[PDB]
């Protein structure tokens, strides 16, 4: 409906399976009348390193540099690098944030890890206190749309990779829940490089079709039990 | 003696607590007669992004860029960027790789994420297929030395952060095990910033003491059961 979506997208190749998933999301959400923004990290050459270049003002302690202290202070003073504050404005206005990425080492590619490290700073995304259900991005929805090398069978409790939910923990809970997001169920598109033409088409359309009803979903309970069972 | 250690270190500040932990590791291993090499990622301005610049000369398929494929072929045809192959030589020669970093979003800082993404390429670290135990770095030891913001109590199974072992899974299992490493128990230095001066000394001194008999240690069983089970 009347909602803003930010898609944070992390793939080098527009003709990729990730690129297709990002474009069907843009096409489907735009069809519904949503306001849609994409941060295409590699095309923006997004800086992933957390450095002292991310602060442009007088440092709180120029003798011993502490990235988290300095960026928290910079956020309050408005002295963060503008690439960071550009992304913060997108996130502040968004009702839903979708992350579209290939799994790299059971996690996000580094360029996207750098977006989380630098954009989700203290004062903007959380405060101490003001995290988990009290995070500063409360009200907002987030969803991981992930592609894998490994097959769905590999990513089971007794498969070699363990259950797919296990590698979701640091991203869903440690990052998105910590910032206050409600987490929608992940979209995992398994092993598209191995899959047939028709399985690949089906995976694209399953995503497109789920997006038709995304505003009707409830978030997951983003708890240890959900991720690990027991 | 004779062992080679590589320390891959990811902190911006030489006077940091991470910096102190890296420096006692160098002091202690050097005292024992070990060959020691440090990759100081921030001081190297190490590139974290996985891009086509990682291949020199010409591409295996310059119409559709697939990073895994292109870097696999580059590795085989000795055509990877020299920042990558410089790291790979350090890893190839090392008996033990220590990673020293502050926890960022239940994981490694993006600069060290990019080291894993770009250094541990197919053909070097693992083959498809050719992993976990068919994994090309077998024989090597790896150890995560992590500092946290949250206290040990926060990091228990019913604490807000969940168990420490839960965030360890993508690094120890999805990355280090997958590559063939035997994984030594993690060194976790919980919450240095909230001091005291004496307890901080204590944590530096336990790390130094542990490194005294590091070569006597048995690896962990790097299993779903160790990370999640009872
Ligand atoms: C550094 C690194 C670390 C990795 N770590 C892991 C890991 O820990 N665990 C794991 O499982 N995997 C891992 N992988 C594998 C990685 O997750 C997969 O290679 C990636 O998820 C595949 O997605 P893709 O977009 O690149 O696929 P592509 O190679 O782009 O897609 C496969 C095929 O789909 C085709 N296609 C594109 N669009 C469409 C469409 N509209 N309809 C039909 N077909 C289409 C493409 O043309 C291509 O033929 C790793 C890879 C790298 C490089
Ligand atoms: C982007 C980001 C994401 C984060 N995500 C998480 C997360 O997911 N989970 C989490 O728990 N935390 C997280 N943190 C917090 C982070 O892990 C801690 O801030 C960090 O681990 C502190 O380690 P440090 O080396 O920077 O401590 P420092 O601030 O460098 O130092 C601690 C104290 O020890 C002093 N010191 C240095 N050397 C010695 C010495 N030899 N003896 C005694 N004292 C010494 C220092 O001067 C300082 O006073 C995050 C931080 C950031 C910026
Ligand atoms: C290309 O596929 C891959 C590349 C790198 C790592 C993995 C892991 C850790 C599991 C998996 O199933 N596939 C992988
Ligand atoms: C400054 O401390 C922190 C910064 C950013 C994230 C965390 C998380 C996820 C848990 C925690 O205990 N502390 C954190
Ligand atoms: Zn959660
Ligand atoms: Zn394992």
From Swiss-Prot, chains A, B:
Its cofactor is Zn(2+); FAD. The keyword Cell inner membrane does not apply. Pfam families: Flavodoxin_2 (PF02525). It catalyses: 1-(beta-D-ribofuranosyl)-1,4-dihydronicotinamide + a quinone + H(+) = beta-nicotinamide D-riboside + a quinol. GO terms for molecular function: chloride ion binding; dihydronicotinamide riboside quinone reductase activity; electron transfer activity; FAD binding; melatonin binding; NAD(P)H dehydrogenase (quinone) activity; oxidoreductase activity; oxidoreductase activity, acting on other nitrogenous compounds as donors. Substrate binds at residues 126-128. Homodimer. PANTHER family: NAD P H OXIDOREDUCTASE-RELATED, RIBOSYLDIHYDRONICOTINAMIDE DEHYDROGENASE [QUINONE]. This is Ribosyldihydronicotinamide dehydrogenase [quinone].
């Amino acid at each position: 409906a009347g909602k803003k979506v930010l898609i944070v997208y992390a793939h080098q190749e527009p003709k990729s399976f990730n690129g297709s998933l990002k474009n069907v999301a843009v096409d489907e959400l735009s069809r519904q009348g949503c306001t849609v923004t994409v941060s295409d990290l590699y095309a923006m050459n997004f800086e992933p390193r957390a450095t002292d270049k991310d602060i442009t003002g007088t440092l709180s302690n120029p003798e011993v540099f502490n990235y988290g202290v300095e960026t928290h202070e910079a956020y309050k003073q408005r002295s963060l690098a503008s690439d960071i504050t550009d992304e913060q404005k997108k996130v502040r206005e968004a009702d839903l944030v979708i992350f579209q990425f290939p799994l790299y080492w059971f996690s996000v590619p580094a360029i996207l890890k750098g977006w989380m490290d630098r954009v989700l700073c203290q004062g903007f995304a959380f405060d101490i206190p003001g995290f988990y259900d009290s995070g500063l991005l409360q009200g907002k929805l987030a969803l991981l749309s992930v592609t894998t090398g490994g097959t769905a069978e590999m990513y089971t409790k007794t498969g070699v990779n363990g259950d797919s939910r296990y590698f979701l923990w640091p991203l869903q809970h440690g990052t998105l829940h910590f910032c206050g997001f409600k987490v929608l169920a992940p979209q995992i598109s398994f092993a598209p490089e191995i899959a047939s033409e028709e399985e690949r088409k089906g995976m694209v359309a399953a995503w497109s079709q789920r997006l038709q009803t995304i505003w009707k979903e409830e978030p997951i309970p983003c708890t240890a039990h959900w991720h690990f069972g027991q």
